[PDB]
Design a protein around this ligand. Structure first.
Ligand SMILES: CCC(=O)Nc1nc(C)cs1
Length: 164
């Protein structure tokens, strides 16, 4: 199963790890992608997960968008996990760098509650511009299912743990 995770709460765990490497190692039932509303997996976690699937995630995502239109900020969709997981839950957290409402971060985390266990990144953190400390607090106060958080940045991981 998941290994080397520090327990933060009854249901939230955290590890300093690259989510792609965690997914290849564990092959979880659900890997969360930090998606945008268009499912254009260019950078950050999205670009890295898509690259690990050899672009299969992007082709599937483009077919989903062509059929259904874009997601909402705070929304999600379940697609294939390809070689990384059974499923990929593409969750859209607000992108603060685009002036998207930070209160939608709680809505984005609520999508995790539809799944018993997930491997996930901190939503809206990194290139999305939100404060990762705030993202972890919203995560622990919103998610009731088992979430295994993979934080890529070591210095960020230490700050998140020491300030929790
Ligand atoms: C290039 C690989 C990469 O960006 N990996 C990332 N893992 C996380 C958890 C965020 S970004």
């Amino acid at each position: 199963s998941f290994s080397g995770y520090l327990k933060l709460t009854d249901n939230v765990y955290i590890k300093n790890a690259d989510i792609v490497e965690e997914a290849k190692k564990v092959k979880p039932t659900v890997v969360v992608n930090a998606a945008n509303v268009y499912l254009k997996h260019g950078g950050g976690v999205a670009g890295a997960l898509n690259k690990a699937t050899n672009n299969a995630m992007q082709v599937e995502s483009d077919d989903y968008i062509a059929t259904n239109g874009p997601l909402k900020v705070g929304g999600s969709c379940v697609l294939s996990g390809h070689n990384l997981a059974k499923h990929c839950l593409h969750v859209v957290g607000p992108n603060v760098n685009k002036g998207e409402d930070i209160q939608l971060l709680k809505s984005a985390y609520e999508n995790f509650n539809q799944h018993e266990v997930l491997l996930a990144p901190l939503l809206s953190a990194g290139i999305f511009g939100a404060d990762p400390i705030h993202s972890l607090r919203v995560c622990v106060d919103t998610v009731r299912t088992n979430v295994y958080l993979a934080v890529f940045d070591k210095n960020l991981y230490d700050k998140l743990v020491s300030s929790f």
